[PDB]
Amino acid sequence: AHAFWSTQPVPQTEDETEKIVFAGPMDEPKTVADIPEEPYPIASTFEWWTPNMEAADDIHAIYELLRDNYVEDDDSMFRFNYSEEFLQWALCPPNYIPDWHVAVRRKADKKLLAFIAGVPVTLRMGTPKYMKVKAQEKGEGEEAAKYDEPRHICEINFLCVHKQLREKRLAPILIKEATRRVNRTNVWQAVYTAGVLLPTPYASGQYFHRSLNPEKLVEIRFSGIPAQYQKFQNPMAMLKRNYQLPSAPKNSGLREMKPSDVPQVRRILMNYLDSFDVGPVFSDAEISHYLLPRDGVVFTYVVENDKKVTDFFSFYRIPSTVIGNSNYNLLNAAYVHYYAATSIPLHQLILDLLIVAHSRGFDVCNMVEILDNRSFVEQLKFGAGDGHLRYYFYNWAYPKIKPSQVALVML
Ligand SMILES: CCCCCCCCCCCCCC(=O)SCCNC(=O)CCNC(=O)[C@H](O)C(C)(C)COP(=O)(O)OP(=O)(O)OC[C@H]1O[C@@H](n2cnc3c(N)ncnc32)[C@H](O)[C@@H]1OP(=O)(O)O
Ligand SMILES: CN(C)CCCN(C)c1nc(N(C)CCC#N)c2cc(Br)ccc2n1
Ligand SMILES: [Mg+2]
């Protein structure tokens, strides 16, 4: 059924995944010397292009390709509209490898036709705790801990083929070439997410949304007035009331993160994340890049009390093109990013996120049920969306885990 994925070092069935007990690579070890130096063959009318992320023009070209040809909902109502500033932020973290950004251009006119992006990530991806002590019960502890140390791997995002070139087996070629460029740097694993089911996810989480400006959401049919709201008249008055938030944060001590916060944010994030089976490890430089506030892009607040950062939350902005619609062109969504609470209940920290998101003009807050995201769903009036984010490894055998054991937020 899978002409491409069947040729690949990923688990091939849900069973394979359910059986696995130890984290480890699938393929036998190779060396950089084993990997072809020459790019993978491509039709003579196309050429491989490595965009420059330091070039506004290259970013612009990538932006346009994604604006018109990237992820849409199942009903072709909405298409994500990642901004140019967002892409520069996502695509160029500290110590990024320019080579891992892989594009196909039409030779004739240099039109961008397809793209895929790899970024470095340090990831804890050793045997999960629930399989690890079961390994102890069976006297298999060292095997279970072989790959406990954080690995410097590749995170894949932004795979996109132009609508005109779809279903011509171009995506497999992109994946092959990306794999090559990554292998050539002595990296053998990748982590990636998708909304579609491919072979074979190690975890899957539902999406959740929290209406911030329900009038607009209903105008654009992101939301339908639930059947039940029509037992009164003015069900848009009641809906508004339902989703109403304060104008100002409730937690004193709440302010924007600043550069001097970096070491303390790092400490408390790392302590929180380390309790999860799969999760990133960040340098100070990475904490700076991913969490310092950045206009239109990422928004980060700390609770400091007595010159001490005790809690933080972050969200990032991804608008979507509303595909028709006379009244509206854009849906303004806040996504829950990294956070940590140590002095207050998480539901109280995240309410403040919602309050801030709302004040600054976001229409909705979204998230996946990873981290401790489930704890605040009901109180904060999140509802489960359609579809799921599926988490995958390339070349890494890994047991099925619950989404609540995953600490890697994907952009
Ligand atoms: C060590 C380093 C390793 C580095 C690489 C790690 C792996 C990277 C993995 C990529 C992670 C990306 C993570 C994200 O960015 S997820 C976001 C993906 N982007 C979109 O959904 C945007 C709109 N869609 C498109 O642009 C295209 O429809 C795409 C490009 C998705 C497929 O193009 P197209 O529709 O023109 O089809 P084709 O004829 O070229 O090819 C058909 C083959 O493609 C397989 N397919 C379909 N969708 C996906 C998908 N989302 N991930 C992986 N594979 C996918 C499919 O099963 C089939 O293979 P097989 O079933 O025949 O075997
Ligand atoms: C962590 N994260 C979901 C980032 C993804 C942002 N995007 C593009 C996104 N994607 C979504 N999907 C792919 C759902 C399709 C399935 N299965 C998505 C789905 C919903 Br529902 C709400 C927000 C979303 N936002
Ligand atoms: Mg294709």
From TrEMBL:
This is Glycylpeptide N-tetradecanoyltransferase. It holds the Pfam family NMT. Residues 26-203 form the Glycylpeptide N-tetradecanoyltransferase N-terminal domain. The lineage of its organism: Eukaryota, Discoba, Euglenozoa, Kinetoplastea, Metakinetoplastina. GO terms for cellular component: cytosol. Residues 1-15 are annotated as: Disordered. SUPFAM superfamilies: Acyl-CoA N-acyltransferases (Nat). It comes from the Eukaryota. CoA binds at residues 2, 4-5, 161, 167, 169, 171, 193. The gene is NMT. Its EC number is 2.3.1.97. Transmembrane segments: none annotated. It comes from Leishmania major. GO terms for molecular function: glycylpeptide N-tetradecanoyltransferase activity; metal ion binding. Keywords: Acyltransferase, Metal-binding, Transferase. Mg(2+) binds at residue 165. Residues 219-402 form the Glycylpeptide N-tetradecanoyltransferase C-terminal domain.
